[PDB]
Design a protein around this nucleic acid. Structure first.
Ligand SMILES: [Zn+2]
Ligand SMILES: [Zn+2]
Ligand SMILES: [Zn+2]
Ligand SMILES: [Zn+2]
Lengths: 73, 72
DNA sequence: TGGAACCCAATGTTCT
DNA sequence: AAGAACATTGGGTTCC
């Protein structure tokens, strides 16, 4: 299938969730770092393969929403 | 000293409009090179100092309609 | 599967 | 004013 956050081609199941590799490192980066991002829209940006980069705020919300956590295993 | 695009550090009329330096470069790059910018919202994103990075579609649109143009 | 370390794309600066 | 040229940040891929 495709990633459950961004719809790119998934690379397997990471931090609990079928994601592609990019969202994997992105989530890892967001959780261990700061993630104080601001949405420039209405906190419901569409996170597809190109737009992934537009809004880290919504991208991270979606990661959370889909269930990602560092302690999956 | 308020940029007509990202309402930031306004530094004189670039490409026909009072703009910051970062919006200066962005515009020439947007028109010159080819990328594809698509809005992830509603084609009305908030383009301010922190958030201008988030949506180049909307930033680019705000540029064009604030009068911006090269070979001015 | 999880993470390191490359590598790269875009932005924003300074300097001319 | 315009633009060459850095520097940097954030992102995404590669691990004969
Ligand atoms: Zn993804
Ligand atoms: Zn958003
Ligand atoms: Zn500006
Ligand atoms: Zn937008």
């Amino acid at each position: 299938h495709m990633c459950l956050v961004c719809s790119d081609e998934a690379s397997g199941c990471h931090y609990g969730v079928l994601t592609c590799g990019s969202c994997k490192v992105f989530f890892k980066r967001a959780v261990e770092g700061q993630h104080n991002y601001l949405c420039a829209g209405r906190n419901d940006c569409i996170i597809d393969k190109i737009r992934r980069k537009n809004c880290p705020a919504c991208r991270y919300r979606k990661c959370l929403q889909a269930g990602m956590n560092l302690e999956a295993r």
